[PDB]
Amino acid sequence: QCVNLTTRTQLPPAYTNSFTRGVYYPDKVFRSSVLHSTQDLFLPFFSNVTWFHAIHKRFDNPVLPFNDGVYFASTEKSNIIRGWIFGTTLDSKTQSLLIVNNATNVVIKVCEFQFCNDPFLGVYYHKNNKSWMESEFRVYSSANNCTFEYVSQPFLMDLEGKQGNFKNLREFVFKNIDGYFKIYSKHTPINLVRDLPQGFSALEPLVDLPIGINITRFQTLLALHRSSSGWTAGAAAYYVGYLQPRTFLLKYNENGTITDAVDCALDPLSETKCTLKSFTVEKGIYQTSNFRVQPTESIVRFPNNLCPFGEVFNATRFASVYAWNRKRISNCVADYSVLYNSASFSTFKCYGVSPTKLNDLCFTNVYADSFVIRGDEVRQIAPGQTGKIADYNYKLPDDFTGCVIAWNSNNLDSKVGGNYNYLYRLFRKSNLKPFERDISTEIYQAGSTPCNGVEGFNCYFPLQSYGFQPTNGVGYQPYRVVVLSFELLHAPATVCGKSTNLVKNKCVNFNFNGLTGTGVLTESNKKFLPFQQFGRDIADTTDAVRDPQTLEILDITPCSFGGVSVITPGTNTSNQVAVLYQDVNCTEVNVFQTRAGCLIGAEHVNNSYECDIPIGAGICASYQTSQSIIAYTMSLGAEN
């Protein structure tokens, strides 16, 4: 519940190592004495595992992740491990997988169980008539929303006193593959050599529950007993491991069990064992895989003339809605970051643009219908809004794409004399056309009077004037309205608008002038004409380049030098090896320079011997006298 542990102390994270553990049966398949390999989420050899234990003032309970899949050791003596809380986010809003056994039943409930602030199991009253009674059945608060309650057959809950050795060595492998919360276990009673768990172990499946949920966390229901405020915790430890996608080489016996299990990436000798499908390697040099120089990073060069954005947007001579000055925008740097920092706007409405890729994606033909109107008439210029503007003189179509940008200039365009020169339309004769300037300057005849210029009797003059007083309200302010229309995907893009540094002599992954290339970037010496950009080789590939931002001649040398060569003697002779990389320069990392490549882990000799293990270029290898692997030029014969 909430009673805190008196024996809780922050013990340091002792990083022990899973030596030979982590080998399980993959499925129900039998073979007879083959060397079968596979690759799956495994506990790797000689990898860190966090040492956990209990003592009379150190007793903890870590929230541990269950992301990939976990390994679990347990060196009990008197059942210090009791149960498991396999909760995803340790919440009762979702269902937490509870596993518990009080030496009666392995009770599995896929239910919503609330994690208490300090749940604890344990035993007490072990002086007279003990019978292994339990401390507190208060490891939860809520109990609801059960999909599948389950009781398996109870395992060997060791009520028998087996003290001393770690014979209660419980190996638990837990993972999920497609809703299968599988238990891969095998209780292996140890044989005492010197006090420690190490040896060749094999594990098997026990039960599966096809549930279909995820779990990302776990704790473990511990026990308390004294050889925990009133009944302390004894001396019993365990390890905690994970699962990583290693590649094993399993050897089977005659009658079922695994005999040898060899992980690949532990040393390249084991990699050679993986490749050759043999646990015993004969005498000779071999070849495991390839070598790949890693690309370090990338170099991207953005393009840098400018569109009239300090000119049209900062103009003085303006237009009207009755006749708008259609700006011609074609093949200019569409600087939309200087459109972005302008916080002086009033109404900025971008309908069908790519507003994240303003500078990235660029457009075919941009038409800026910029015209200054009265303040209230901004809400009508929209696909979906009509009225005094949209159906009278200036129609955006229903296939409109572009922005509508407005900002006020009440300090300059307002006047006591008033900006009555910019005239606007009030009535409507014909159905309004999209993107067509209606400049019909004829009297709006609404009757049987042929006006033809005169006003008065049935002669309506809708060509009215802006009253831009210096004390205008919010509806009469002169807004510098720009409806930035454009044309999308009907031409190759003309109106088109943060580069990186230059890194030479390193294996990077550049992106110069559309192509994303990879190689060590040096500087060439050729004669590039200023239009000539791409050097081609005899193999018709990219050889020598130039930055489109800064004029400079470059040279490219590709990465991924050669492959992996493995030098070994006979396995019955020795198990020390030597590493050779195929025709590389000594860069990666004893270290020798040969014509065959950079040699690793050998001794050079000022003599010459008869060739046993050849390498190349008249250089052979041998295991002579401490005995090690020496590198030497081959003896050509007896100088008789």
Epitope: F345, T347, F348, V353, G384, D398
Partner: nanobody
Framework: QLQLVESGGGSVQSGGSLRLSCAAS????????????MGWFRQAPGKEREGVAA???????SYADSVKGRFTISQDNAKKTLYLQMNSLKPEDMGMYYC????????????????????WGQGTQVTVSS
């Protein structure tokens, strides 16, 4: 005509943790996109309709600094449903919440101004007792 359905109200105390939700209705989605400029325009008893939590089509959230640090507006574009996790309601959070609509893209300094919203929802009410 583009319409919206406010919901998510609830009469709580001073410091309530609720969530708003704006169900998308209407007939016009006048854009080639499904991402829009929206915002929960609260109109308090005794104050005007004000931009409290607003977000545009790119995700630039617009907040007021008196209510900043508690609320969480999340425009779920896969269902066109605007949300506002009303966390720890101060006593000025009472009011009729209006999610407004726009088929366009507004910046961070114009999402709070309700002058450019020609499509308005119904409205939801939250009673924040002090």
């Amino acid at each position: 005509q583009l319409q919206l359905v406010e919901s998510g109200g609830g009469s709580v105390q001073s410091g309530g943790s609720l969530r708003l939700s704006c169900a998308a209705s209407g007939y016009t989605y006048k854009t080639y996109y499904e991402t829009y400029s929206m915002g929960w325009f609260r109109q308090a008893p005794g104050k005007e309709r004000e931009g409290v939590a607003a977000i545009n089509s790119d995700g630039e959230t617009s907040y007021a600094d008196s209510v900043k640090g508690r609320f969480t507006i999340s425009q779920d574009n896969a269902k066109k449903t605007l949300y506002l996790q009303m966390n720890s309601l101060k006593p000025e959070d009472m009011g009729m919440y209006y999610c407004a609509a726009d088929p366009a893209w507004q910046p961070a300094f114009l999402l709070l101004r309700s002058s450019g919203y020609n499509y308005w929802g119904q409205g939801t009410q939250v009673t924040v007792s002090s």
